[PDB]
């Protein structure tokens, strides 16, 4: 669960 | 938990190209996660460098698209920051993080003087 | 990239009061704003994420409220405990950015 600007 | 060191010369001369080493305890850098390196200037405003993620990628921010490398040591389990052609601009304070839900982990950061 | 404004770029309340920040983002950001403490001589602090999430170990004096572009950050109740910087960023975007920040003083 990686915020999206962390590719 | 997760926590992370940096390391680095804490004076260079303009011209020169600083390296910082961060080095990051009770996680592999290779698990998950994205490990960036970050920057408040004298005025406290902060400055997202770029990171590298588990698996190789690396992102940076355009407006120093040219002068940062950003690699890592698996075996090590360390990412560094090279930063070339340093000026006096660029003294700050460097830190390096994990990104996730935001930067929920932080280094304590280590000062960074440009000067002659 | 994406700049997101912090409007007080100051502030001083008592103990007990509320105090409200705001962050605004020039476009959508979802709600992926994440909120920062940071105290004289230490690093940054994960205080909300998710826009509103309550990260770890955070007082419940702590909340958060917004989406895309329009952010704020509440505390319940003041404390000379909370005395440091606040600052806001977005982590929906290519190159992460943070606010100009907002200091808070305490008053006596």
């Known amino acids: 669960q990686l915020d999206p600007a962390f590719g | 938990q997760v926590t992370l060191s940096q390391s680095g010369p804490g004076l260079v001369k303009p011209s020169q190209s600083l390296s910082l080493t961060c080095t990051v305890t009770?996680?592999?850098?290779?698990?998950?996660?994205?490990w960036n390196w970050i920057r408040q200037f004298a005025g406290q405003s902060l400055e997202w460098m770029g990171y590298?993620?588990?698996?190789?990628?690396?992102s940076y921010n355009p407006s120093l698209k040219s002068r940062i490398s950003i690699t890592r040591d698996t075996s090590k389990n360390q990412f560094f920051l090279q930063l070339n052609s340093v000026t006096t601009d660029d003294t700050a304070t460097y830190y390096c993080?994990?990104?996730?839900?935001?930067?929920?982990?932080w280094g304590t950061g280590t000062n960074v003087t440009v000067s002659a | 990239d994406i700049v997101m404004t912090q409007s007080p770029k100051s502030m001083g309340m008592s103990v007990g009061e509320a105090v409200t920040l705001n962050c605004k983002a020039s476009?959508?950001?979802?709600?992926?704003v994440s909120w920062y403490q940071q105290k004289p001589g230490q690093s940054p602090v994960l205080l909300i994420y998710?826009?509103?999430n309550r990260y770890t170990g955070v007082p419940d004096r702590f909340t958060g409220s917004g989406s895309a572009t329009d952010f704020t950050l509440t505390i319940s109740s003041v404390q000379a405990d909370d005395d440091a910087d606040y600052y806001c960023?977005?982590?929906?975007?290519?190159?992460?950015?943070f606010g100009g920040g907002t200091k808070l003083e305490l008053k006596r």
């Open positions: 993080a994990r990104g996730g839900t935001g930067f929920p982990y």
């Open positions: 009770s996680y592999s850098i290779t698990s998950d996660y994205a």
């Open positions: 590298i993620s588990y698996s190789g990628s690396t």
């Open positions: 476009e959508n950001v979802g709600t992926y």
């Open positions: 998710g826009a509103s």
């Open positions: 960023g977005q982590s929906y975007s290519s190159p992460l950015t």
